[PDB]
Design a protein around this ligand. Structure first.
Ligand SMILES: CCC(=O)N[C@H]1[C@H]([C@H](O)[C@H](O)CO)O[C@@](O)(C(=O)O)C[C@@H]1O
Ligand SMILES: CCC(=O)N[C@H]1[C@H]([C@H](O)[C@H](O)CO)O[C@@](O)(C(=O)O)C[C@@H]1O
Ligand SMILES: CCC(=O)N[C@H]1[C@H]([C@H](O)[C@H](O)CO)O[C@@](O)(C(=O)O)C[C@@H]1O
Ligand SMILES: [Zn+2]
Ligand SMILES: [Zn+2]
Ligand SMILES: [Zn+2]
Lengths: 183, 185, 183
């Protein structure tokens, strides 16, 4: 019960532009009051599979949202599927779906919901990953905590790029970050 | 110490003094994972010299430093930029009722990161990172963290904030950065 | 036994171009399903000690490989010496070589060995470190999991730079990353 994950296989579990068009590999490991997070993305099909900005200049970014309720349970309006998001057992999941993961949630005082109080940048982490493992193919991964509505908690991943890529497959290197846990 | 968290609390009440008294909120969370400390940091400047940056009118205002000084027991010293009042072990979204006496297991390893001496100074006592002002991807600032290079203390952690862009009326409040370092014990 | 390391002293322990020409400082700390890794390098002698790309225009990269068997034991073809790699005991290592460290190995489902199947980039982590702690002397540290032959598991560090450095000592700042554990 110290690790919440997608499993490490490559079976599509995520819907960006069309049903199960991607594998988001996300591993959350509870190190007390901090969650250690490891993420990568493979797109297998649809609009974001093969990037061509000569042909499609406007395709420059997309977002993957994980929305959670009071008990830390993934809501079905998330881009990530509920089917294999669960606590770890081996290279797989526990047999039954979890009902509480509040200790894996981003801290609401650290990272508050939108309000008429001043909005601070500390609820964001920026990173850069590399498409196809090539050092001249950067894309920015921007992670934001608790800024979606219709949820108690949220983790959102925005992927974007500034280069004009021609036929570059969107599959990434891995990035590690952390965040402050709710409890 | 095992698995505990030493932190500033995660609210936005100013706890830190850069240019003038309580001009900033340093949010710092140190979590012990055995022989390494997992660190998470951000900064909000609320007042004074470094609150709103304009390098057109003031091209030479480009960097500043925040120091955490520790004694032999890992207790924060009063002359650190960070105030002692809310630097303590975690309890809920606040701190334990007793001001801590021992945190040597949270201190940067002195063999890995020695104090200044006339022996060769190696770069491994530094971690560089980049954070973004206002959460804007075109507003980077460098956060340089250095271990055990201060004097008048047994241990130290120093944060130097710098930028090479010419900012015009930009509020210095940052995204978050994560790093680790080797623990003394 | 929760940390495998090199001892954080300055005594050479690694062979890049000639015997004991470097000190690799590597600390691997098990946080359940993830290994938290911290790395830096000091080159003390030989070809890579002082970089001069006026004199030697093509000297722009090198690699340090850690190769492991089925029990997570370091193999002798590794650049890092076997005598220097063990579980932590104080500021030193235990006197006896360990027999098992499978819990510290990179996960083979997450990071499979080379094959005829499609290779994904998530077995790579990119970072940048700074020579001599100077902010204008970046070098790229590319870390790759389980891609070497002659082993069950591997961690390889490729160091490279694009700048024309003139008489710059190769000793680095520190970088942190994580990876998914085999067990
Ligand atoms: C971590 C790796 C890294 O820094 N990659 C950077 C890359 C390389 O430095 C050079 O291409 C030499 O390989 O240069 C960029 O300007 C590019 O778009 O190509 C930005 C990348 O972020
Ligand atoms: C992680 C985010 C990131 O890399 N930001 C970089 C930024 C963006 O790539 C572009 O502005 C396109 O958004 O480019 C810079 O040259 C800039 O100062 O603008 C350096 C920043 O570090
Ligand atoms: C974290 C530190 C950092 O970003 N360093 C970058 C550096 C500094 O921004 C400037 O020298 C101003 O100090 O600019 C570079 O183009 C350079 O080669 O000099 C790339 C470095 O990666
Ligand atoms: Zn494909
Ligand atoms: Zn302000
Ligand atoms: Zn020399």
């Amino acid at each position: 019960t110290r690790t919440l994950w997608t499993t490490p296989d490559t079976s599509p579990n995520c819907t960006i532009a069309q049903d199960k068009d991607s594998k988001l590999t996300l591993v959350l490991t509870k190190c007390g009051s901090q969650i250690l997070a490891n993420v990568s993305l493979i797109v297998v099909a649809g609009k974001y599979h093969i990037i061509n900005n000569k042909t499609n200049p406007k395709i420059k970014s997309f977002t993957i949202k994980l929305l959670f309720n009071k008990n830390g349970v993934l809501l079905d309006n998330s881009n990530l599927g509920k089917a294999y998001w669960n606590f770890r057992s081996g290279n797989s999941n526990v047999s039954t779906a979890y009902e509480k993961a509040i200790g894996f949630m981003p801290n609401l005082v650290a990272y508050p919901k939108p309000s008429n109080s001043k909005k601070y940048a500390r609820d964001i982490v920026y990173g850069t990953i590399y498409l196809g493992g090539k050092p001249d193919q950067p894309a920015v991964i921007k992670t934001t905590f608790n800024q979606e509505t219709g949820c108690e908690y949220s983790i959102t991943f925005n992927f974007s790029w500034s280069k004009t890529y021609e036929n570059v497959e969107f599959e990434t290197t891995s990035f590690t970050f952390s965040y402050i846990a709710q409890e």
